[PDB]
Amino acid sequence: MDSEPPSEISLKNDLEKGDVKSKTEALKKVIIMILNGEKLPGLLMTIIRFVLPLQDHTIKKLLLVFWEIVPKTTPDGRLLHEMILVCDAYRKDLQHPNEFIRGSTLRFLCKLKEAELLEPLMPAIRACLEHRHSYVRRNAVLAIYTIYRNFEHLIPDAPELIHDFLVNEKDASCKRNAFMMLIHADQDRALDYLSTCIDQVQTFGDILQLVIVELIYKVCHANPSERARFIRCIYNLLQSSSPAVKYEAAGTLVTLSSAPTAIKAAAQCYIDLIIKESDNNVKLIVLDRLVELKEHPAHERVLQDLVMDILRVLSTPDLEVRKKTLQLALDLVSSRNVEELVIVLKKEVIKTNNVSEHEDTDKYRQLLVRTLHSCSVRFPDMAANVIPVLMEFLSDSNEAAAADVLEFVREAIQRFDNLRMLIVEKMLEVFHAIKSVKIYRGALWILGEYCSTKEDIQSVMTEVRRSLGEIPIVESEIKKEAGELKPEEEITVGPVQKLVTEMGTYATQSALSSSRPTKKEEDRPPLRGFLLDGDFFVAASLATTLTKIALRYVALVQEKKKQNSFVAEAMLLMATILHLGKSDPVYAEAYVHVNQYDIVLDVLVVNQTSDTLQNCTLELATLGDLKLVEKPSPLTLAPHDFANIKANVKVASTENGIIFGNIVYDVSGAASDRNCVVLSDIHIDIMDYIQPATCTDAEFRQMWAEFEWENKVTVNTNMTDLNDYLQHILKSTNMKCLTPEKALSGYCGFMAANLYARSIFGEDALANVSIEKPVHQGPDAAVTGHIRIRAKSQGMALSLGDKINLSQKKTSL
């Protein structure tokens, strides 16, 4: 009988039957239905009658079982007395020669904090005063303590009965087996006795002595219990810069992340931390101790650095461990992050050296070039390293492989003015075999800026200019680029001037030069030719032309703040980006009142009628996410009764199977068809059910992408900013205004709120409230705001859309 709540009639029958097995099974079936929480008092006389005196342990044990989980509730066969049918003949049970029945009886009897059993539990310590097992003596210290807990904090429970009444706790210390139920409030002499016992311990018993009294002067003295306290005590005597090298903490710690890569990744972190405490700049974070595994002697054999190499990773162990490991290389050794990121990047970025680090997918290659290159932009020393490695990247000599390479290096030159003169000659080489945009773009920029340095350019450019591949974006990049630097410093059959001619043709003009350009018609609609066409005031010469622009870098460009940079090593970053970091007539009148922060729905129940409505009961219901914190409890609604009855309200619950409308309120009365009527007290909305939750800009952005929010409305009374009406109203449809999606200035400055919720509707809810408050001569519609809304199938989107207008209720009875 797993859980069957109607079966009590059969149990009575089964409980006495003249067959002992049946009786045991019955009583067992009662236990299992109560434990789940089901019907049990009908049976009581039957249950109690067979078992009572006997020394036959199994039925007695079963009855003994049922007296610690419901004795108080059941009363057919027990009623209320001092020597109840729980203990009257269980004084026999306590005083049987078999330890088990006595012991069991003692154990339940003393366990209860019952006051209708207080006297019978007190000399119940007799059953276990003699200690036939470790179990008997432990059973005794726990039972005396449980007696002490049960209203006997004074002389009824404190001395000895004949050996224990609160003194097993003392005795246990010096006896062969220990266990101290003495944790609080008990004899001082036993506490003292436990200390002595630390030495003459029994190990289970030591965990009991130890919860009470901890800290040792020793190293130990033995056993897991003492050992477990000991690592706590050690952390005290050296708190300083974490544990560093984990103590006896290490054993539990592995299981704490049994799923399976995460342990190594964690372990790797600690091992890296431990090596050294470095400068602790941007991603140079290694704490713990400065010297404890050093770094870098030149006589150390086979050195520290061997372990450091693991941390430099491509994936060399698996991805979770990889992400931890790349950060960890950066963390022990660099200048900041820059130094060790360049080494690390050199390995990752595409080459002709190894083909286990090159790939023909263009974005990844490109990104890897940008990561290597960002290190230079960060720190100078890296410029010198980066440029020759970049030329190796080029040497791959696939159209695309060159292409990616050329694209970053060209950015580097914008930063690094006439420093990378050397690269230009390498960069031209792979520009001729071509099937893509990227190669043309980049090459034309290097060869263009670099012209003073070289003289090749008609020849290199011209094979490509009459070759094909994909050429949209090529136009833009060649347009600003081709002439640049020194007015007449090249010549192969086209000097720098031919280049300016070319540069202009490629931009949007027409001219025979480099055997004509591939295309002329520019990239995306805004860019066009014209700016540059106007430009080249002084023909490709460092002055105030293309050259200027080329040998200068747009805004601030420093660090790895992503200003001509990309922020570490490209593969590690994907993982970091991913991390969102999300945090019968009846009359009612009613108002909601709050006194001393108690929120209640006031209801007055009125019988305007002369007719009888007796049988009157009042209930507030649990609909779904609405709940009663206590229904109105008066038996009112009688002939010409006016009553004030208070129903307390909650807003947060779990969905019930009954209707999901406004608030259900139920009054009952006389009638047999409609004994229960549902009638209303004032408004509560569907919107309550939504649950508020919040987003950060990353979670908002991810969800924006994840599912559409095209749906918009413009809501009146969003004249005001985010903070005022809009927040308060948004709150009531369990929403909250978080992070921005705005871009403010002297022409821009709609207020933008990123909203989130996680509705109990199987959807989230998100929105952006844009408040069109004029920051221009031509506003949208002046003050008002357009709320762009969604939910996960946009079923709550709509709630956001209208619950940001207005919202107010009041009455004054």
Binding site: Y587, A588, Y591, N595, T811, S812
Partner: protein
């Protein structure tokens, strides 16, 4: 036709409509019976009462029960509230096809396929009667709304009308003493197979499977095994009244009358359900719903919906109206037609209804419209949207078609539509499907007029002649011109004040009440759109927005007057009463009370003495009397209710006299209140009151600070000691400075162990001896001269004021 309900259950042999409530029972061939709340969508019960087909099903609503008959050969009675079998009885010896319940005593009738229908009395031991005649199966037994007679449809080619209180049927010749039944050729030929004959009816269509009545007619229609339906008079057994409806293709299981339409609805065991003309008695149209065969039919005796049972399940289907146009005059609701004929007026919480003569509608409603003075009703008839029909005007208090044909009142004339309009006796009509104006020449206008025409909009309903083709257009009195057009969001309704000059329109929050043309007088405060609400011409606006009728406002007061037990629409407010009718159109009325209204009419006119009487438990709530009256910043209302320890606290800061605060603060059992009121106290000016508070919040150090500022020296010392012990070094420390000598610090600091600080303080005052004590007890060296003096005079003249600022003067207003 609209599908209200459709639940696939599999082959439903029996179907019955509850006459009390809008419920359906179905008995299935699968042996399951189900009771459905078809409007609510909630399964009431489900019983497998027999293995095989259960062919008959009935409601036994005399006490809240359902009755079923199955092929167990029994009529069983079942509880729908307790789900138990109330009683079981032996109907017959074969299939119970249909069962019917007597309302005389708990007698049950069962019709069987063993050729008898019997009635059995449970209450006693008796089987009271057996009604015999059939020679082949009584397929169905059906109640009329009177309980005296029943009809049975049997497949021996007859319909037998029975008496249930009678032995079989009940009749006796007054022209002879002999039995009505003749077994010989008389004026008709039949056998001897009855006790007597009251009415043997034709059923010839090779046996009639079912018979049923229209709720208000003696006429019955029967569907039979062939492919015809035959309509019979059961009240005379005429054969000059019986017409045959032809359309079906195979054995017609049933045919019953549609209560609410002038059509007869039939269903057959082919695959079609066919609808029949009830003024022509032949098939108007056939529908296939492709659930295959239909073995049962049902027409609602509560005139709700209509239902037919099929071999896949059953459907209850809808041919009814939703949201009808209406207006209330003084005690008369006038509404546009809905099910259950004409009803209205009276009740206030019951879903019962009762009749009064106030029918605005008494013929197909092309238009129903009130006079703006409310003295006539215009009902436009003979449908059409061509250019002509008829319009009949009725008098508003009690309505006939014509009142007298010899009197100006109740006349009729032609006009496609006619609808009343302002000037308060006028009407405007369409009689060419243009806007024509109507006069009669004095009194409420009844006579057709052809002058004046327009070329915009198209005739329909209204109350000011509403016409639509893209908007709701109000038309003028004596001008062809459009008076104005309204475009707004609606909840399917148009709400009139009661006078039909004015109109109320529903908007995004609540409703707005407006005058003639579109001019907004005010907006009803309430978050959501109300279902309906009406204004007693202006001022007292009463509305429904849920299940309760509450006043938006009366004289600036706000109240919920009372709740009803059903959702409802306000019919309008004309008089003190507000009258309501819902979708089904059951009435509720409510007297506008002097409950909530008097209380706040009184509080507004600053009467508190009046207001105490006014306080009743029909309007007490929690915050409109006992805590709403704690909402004046110069307490007035606040003074009156102050019973809550919080309201008392509040009251005190709003005056600025915190003498009451401390006590409320006390009774709020809280420290925070004492410190905050103490601060307010310092603000009224007096520091005695501040001290007491601040002392018990334990801000001895704030006090220490306050105290020279206040100019006490005695009190300042008390603070020093009781802050000494706390080691508040910006409490105990203060006071020594503040008195002319520093000695207080010296000891406190000694106890802190701050010997240095203690010496410096002491030494400077020239208490070098104490300074030395501190040095000697602790580490010496007192010689050192810090960035502050270590021995330069400290003396201050403490507080020149003789009366202190604990004794700050006050008068208090």
């Amino acid at each position: 036709m609209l599908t209200k309900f459709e639940t696939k259950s599999a082959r439903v042999k029996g179907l019955s409509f509850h006459p009390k409530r809008p419920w359906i029972l179905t008995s299935l061939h699968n042996g399951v019976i189900q009771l459905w709340d078809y409007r609510m969508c909630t399964l009431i019960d489900k019983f497998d009462e027999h293995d095989g087909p259960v062919r008959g099903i009935d409601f036994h609503k005399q006490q809240p029960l359902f009755v079923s008959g199955g092929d167990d050969y029994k009529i069983k009675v079942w509880n729908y509230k307790l789900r138990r079998c109330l009683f079981t009885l032996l109907g017959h010896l074969d299939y119970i096809r249909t069962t019917f319940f007597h309302h005389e005593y708990p007698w049950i009738l069962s019709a069987s396929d063993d050729q008898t229908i019997r009635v059995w009395n449970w209450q006693s031991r008796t089987c009271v009667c057996v009604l015999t005649g059939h020679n082949h199966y009584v397929m169905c037994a059906q109640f009329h709304p009177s309980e005296d007679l029943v009809v049975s449809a049997s497949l021996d080619q007859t319909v037998r009308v029975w008496d249930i209180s009678g032995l079989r049927k009940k009749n006796l010749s007054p022209g002879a003493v002999e039995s009505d039944v003749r077994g010989i050729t008389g004026v008709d030929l039949f056998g001897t197979t009855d006790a007597v004959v009251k009415h043997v009816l034709e059923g010839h269509d090779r046996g009639v499977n079912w018979a049923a009545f229209h709720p208000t007619m003696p006429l019955i229609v029967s569907g039979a095994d062939d492919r015809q339906v035959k309509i019979w008079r059961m009240n005379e057994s005429k054969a000059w009244e019986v017409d045959t409806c032809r359309g079906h293709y195979n054995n017609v299981s049933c045919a019953v009358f549609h209560p609410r339409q002038e059509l007869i609805l039939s269903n057959s065991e082919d695959k079609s359900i066919r609808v029949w003309d009830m003024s022509k008695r032949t098939g108007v149209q056939t529908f296939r719903r492709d659930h295959d065969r239909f073995w049962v039919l049902a027409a609602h005796p509560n005139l709700n919906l209509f239902a037919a049972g099929h071999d896949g399940g059953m459907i209850v289907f809808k041919l009814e109206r939703e949201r009808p146009a209406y207006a209330v005059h003084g005690n008369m609701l006038h509404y546009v037609k809905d099910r259950f004929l004409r009803q209205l007026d009276f009740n206030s919480s019951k879903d019962v209804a009762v009749m009064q003569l106030r029918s605005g509608s008494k013929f197909p409603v092309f238009n129903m419209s009130y006079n703006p003075a409310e003295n006539a009703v215009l009902l436009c008839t003979r449908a059409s949207n061509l250019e002509n029909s008829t319009y009949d005007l009725y008098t508003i208090p009690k309505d006939a078609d014509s009142q007298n044909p010899d009197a100006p009142e109740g006349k009729r004339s032609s006009g496609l539509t006619a609808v009343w309009v302002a000037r308060n006796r006028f009407a405007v009509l369409d009689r060419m499907h243009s806007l024509l104006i109507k006069n009669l020449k004095n009194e409420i206008t009844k006579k057709i007029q052809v002058p004046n025409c327009d070329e915009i909009f198209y005739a329909g309903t209204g109350n000011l002649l509403l016409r639509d083709a893209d908007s709701i257009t109000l038309f003028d009195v004596q001008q062809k011109r459009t008076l104005a057009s309204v475009k707004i969001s609606k909840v399917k309704y148009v709400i009139w004040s009661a006078d039909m000059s004015h109109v109320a329109l529903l908007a995004k929050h609540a409703i707005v009440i407006c005058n003639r043309k579109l001019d907004a007088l005010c907006n009803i405060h309430e978050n959501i759109r109300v279902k309906s609400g009406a204004w007693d011409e202006s001022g007292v606006f009463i509305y429904t927005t849920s299940n309760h009728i509450k006043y938006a406002v009366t004289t600036g007061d706000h109240g919920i007057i009372r709740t009803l037990d059903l959702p409802i629409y306000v019919t309008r407010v004309k008089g003190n009463n507000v009258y309501c009718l819902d979708r089904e159109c059951r009435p509720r009325v409510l007297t506008i009370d002097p409950t909530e209204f008097k209380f706040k009419l009184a509080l507004i006119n600053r009467k508190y003495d009046e207001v105490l009487h006014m306080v009743r438990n029909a309007k007490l709530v929690g915050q409109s009397i006992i805590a709403y009256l704690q909402k004046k910043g110069y307490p007035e209302v606040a003074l009156h209710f102050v019973k809550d320890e919080k309201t008392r606290f509040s009251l005190a800061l709003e005056c600025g006299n915190i003498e009451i605060a401390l006590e409320a603060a006390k009774a709020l059992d809280d420290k925070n209140c004492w410190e905050k009121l103490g601060e307010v106290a310092l603000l009224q000016g007096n520091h005695q009151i501040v001290e007491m508070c601040y002392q018990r919040t334990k801000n001895f150090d704030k006090l220490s600070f306050l105290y020279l500022i206040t100019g006490n020296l005695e009190k300042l010392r008390k603070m020093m000691k009781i802050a000494e012990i706390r080691k508040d070094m910006s409490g105990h420390y203060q006071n020594a400075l503040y008195l002319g000598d520093v000695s207080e610090r010296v000891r406190i600091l000694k106890n802190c162990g701050q010997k240095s600080l203690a010496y410096l303080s002491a030494a400077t005052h020239g208490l070098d001896e104490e300074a030395e004590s501190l040095k000697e007890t602790f580490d010496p060296e007192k010689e050192t001269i810090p960035d502050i003096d270590p021995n330069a005079k400290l003396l201050q003249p403490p507080a020149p004021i003789m009366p202190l600022d604990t004794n700050w003067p006050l008068l208090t207003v």
